[PDB]
Amino acid sequence: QAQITGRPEWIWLALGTALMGLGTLYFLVKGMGVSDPDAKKFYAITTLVPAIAFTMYLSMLLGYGLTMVPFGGEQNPIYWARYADWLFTTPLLLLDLALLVDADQGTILALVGADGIMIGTGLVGALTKVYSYRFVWWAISTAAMLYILYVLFFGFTSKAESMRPEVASTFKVLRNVTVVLWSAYPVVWLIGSEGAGIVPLNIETLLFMVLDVSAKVGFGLILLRSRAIFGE
Numbered sequence: 429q430a431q432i433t434g435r436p437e438w439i440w441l442a443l444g445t446a447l448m449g450l451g452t453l454y455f456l457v458k459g460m461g462v463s464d465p466d467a468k469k470f471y472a473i474t475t476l477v478p479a480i481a482f483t484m485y486l487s488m489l490l491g492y493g494l495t496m497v498p499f500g501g502e503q504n505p506i507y508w509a510r511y512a513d514w515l516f517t518t519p520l521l522l523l524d525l526a527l528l529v530d531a532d533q534g535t536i537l538a539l540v541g542a543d544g545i546m547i548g549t550g551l552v553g554a555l556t557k558v559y560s561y562r563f564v565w566w567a568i569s570t571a572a573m574l575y576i577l578y579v580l581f582f583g584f585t586s587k588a589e590s591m592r593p594e595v596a597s598t599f600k601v602l603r604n605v606t607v608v609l610w611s612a613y614p615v616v617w618l619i620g621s622e623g624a625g626i627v628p629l630n631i632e633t634l635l636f637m638v639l640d641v642s643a644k645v646g647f648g649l650i651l652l653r654s655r656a657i658f659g660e
């Protein structure tokens with residue numbers, strides 16, 4: 429019965445794998461030249477971001493990143509490999525914006541640590557047997573997400589507006605893309621296999637695939653095609 433997997437969403441997973449891989453090879457066979465030590469950081473960060481995602485999408489495709497969790501009434505398919513991906517790649521995406529706005533080490537740590545909680549709490553939620561409690565973890569997770577998005581929006585903007593026109597402009601486009609795509613993740617989870625079965629794992633997988641590529645390759649293509657602070 430149980431929210432069928434290991435087979436339907438294979439195309440979505442495979443397609444995720446393809447885009448993340450090509451996006452990685454792209455950022456690689458583009459960062460060939462690049463002298464500027466500042467620009468060097470952005471290329472490095474933004475190339476690991478989809479490389480993590482490639483590794484993890486492969487595992488889901490090949491089955492390894494799938495597991496079964498007892499909840500609600502049945503044997504529920506869960507892709508923990510998402511959370512393995514998200515754990516590292518999401519802090520890196522924050523580090524891109526931090527570096528771009530030259531944010532204080534204080535905020536950076538507060539940020540990365542908070543992101544740690546947000547995804548880790550997701551990881552606990554996703555695997556919690558007791559149905560009712562999954563939403564306790566979701567609430568904590570989305571609160572931690574909201575905090576991050578707050579400092580990005582109401583914080584990092586002001587600091588950005590004081591940099592260079594290019595920096596303020598570039599940060600803003602990213603900030604927009606970030607706040608939006610981020611806000612979708614807890615909604616997809618809430619309505620998906622993970623939470624309330626409004627939407628099947630099949631669509632949950634597809635939504636997350638489109639969101640993940642957008643939030644990584646799409647994100648990276650805004651960044652690595654602009655003036656990356658002093659550098660290019």
Ligand SMILES: *C\C=C(C)/C=C/C=C(C)/C=C/C1=C(C)CCCC1(C)C
Binds near residue numbers: 547613
């Ligand atoms: C793939 C790259 C990005 C930017 C991923 C972002 C992921 C999130 C903001 C995930 C948030 C979650 C929440 C708030 C609650 C359910 C569990 C999630 C981990 C999906």
